[PDB]
Design a protein around this ligand. Structure first.
Ligand SMILES: Nc1nc2c(ncn2[C@@H]2O[C@H](COP(=O)(O)OP(=O)(O)NP(=O)(O)O)[C@@H](O)[C@H]2O)c(=O)[nH]1
Ligand SMILES: [Ca+2]
Ligand SMILES: [Ca+2]
Ligand SMILES: [Mg+2]
Length: 166
């Protein structure tokens, strides 16, 4: 069957693991255990197609990691995640996109910008600001809540639909 290699990246604590775990295991992780690199696999049907999602959940990073770059090289699509209540995480997105461009050696890599923790009221990143950033990259912007599951399936499935247009 068709396999889709997805990689989740973004600043520490934005909810990358919570999003992946909500998608794959249907529960919300309340505690904060920093990730290095964890992988998840699951067969799902997306738009009538039975396929296998292979998801690499990476941890936030502010220091070079040769190993990190190597694990990311095989990714086919990337979820770039920031949290809507953490301006710095949004400002960090451009660096993650640059890392992706490097490891893939391409300026055209399937990606989706995700603004997580949309259930929280302390918003410092407005939807419009994120929409503008995503537009500049030629990619979709989707808000999510790993807590309520709002937009979770939408974010990952949209990433699959982006790989399909590639
Ligand atoms: N309210 C709320 N909290 C969230 C959401 N997503 C994650 N969190 C919380 O934020 C904290 C960190 O989440 P986690 O998924 O571990 O972050 P991460 O990006 O994987 N961290 P790392 O980069 O260190 O692996 C946890 O306490 C978790 O419950 C969300 O959508 N809403
Ligand atoms: Ca723990
Ligand atoms: Ca390269
Ligand atoms: Mg994590």
């Amino acid at each position: 069957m068709t396999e889709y290699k997805l990689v989740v990246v973004g600043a520490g604590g934005v909810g990358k693991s919570a999003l992946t775990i909500q998608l794959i295991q249907n529960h919300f992780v309340d505690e904060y255990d920093p990730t290095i690199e964890d992988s998840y696999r699951k067969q799902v049907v997306i738009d009538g197609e039975t396929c296998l999602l292979d998801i690499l959940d990476t941890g936030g990073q502010e220091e070079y990691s040769a190993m990190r770059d190597q694990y990311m090289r095989t990714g086919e699509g990337f979820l770039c995640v920031f949290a809507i209540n953490n301006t710095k995480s949004f400002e960090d997105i451009h660096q993650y996109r640059e890392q992706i461009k490097r490891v893939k050696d391409s300026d055209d890599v399937p990606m989706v910008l995700v603004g997580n923790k949309c259930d929280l009221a302390a918003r410092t990143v407005e939807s419009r600001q994120a929409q503008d950033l995503a537009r500049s990259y030629g990619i979709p912007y989707i808000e999510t809540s790993a807590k309520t599951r709002q937009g979770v399936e939408d974010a990952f499935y949209t990433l699959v639909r982006e790989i399909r247009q590639h």
